[PDB]
Design a protein around this ligand. Sequence first.
Ligand SMILES: *[C@@H]1O[C@H](CO)[C@@H](O)[C@H](O)[C@H]1NC(C)=O
Lengths: 45, 48
Amino acid sequence: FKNIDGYFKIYSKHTPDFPQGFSALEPLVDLPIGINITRFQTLLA
Amino acid sequence: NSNKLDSKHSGNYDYWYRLFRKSKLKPFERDISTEIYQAGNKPCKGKG
Ligand SMILES: *[C@@H]1O[C@H](CO)[C@@H](O)[C@H](O)[C@H]1NC(C)=O
């Protein structure tokens, strides 16, 4: 994710410690939010 | 020029504008707040 001049950007790739082979990422959404953001948290199930 | 919806007898002070901000305002960034500007080194919270 990023928020350069707004325009919230989300990318995602699902590949069926950490894998070493290269992986790409495809944008699904691109929405111009244009707000001030400072902190991040993740929800759970 | 709009002196119709923004003028009437006895005056209208409804609108507002900011002069005291802790720093410069970044483009396209709203800084809505009612926070008293600090002068000197006092943590005064209020008017006066
Ligand atoms: C956005 O947030 C930062 C960190 O609080 C602040 O420095 C900045 O002035 C804010 N944007 C504005 C009000 O232009």
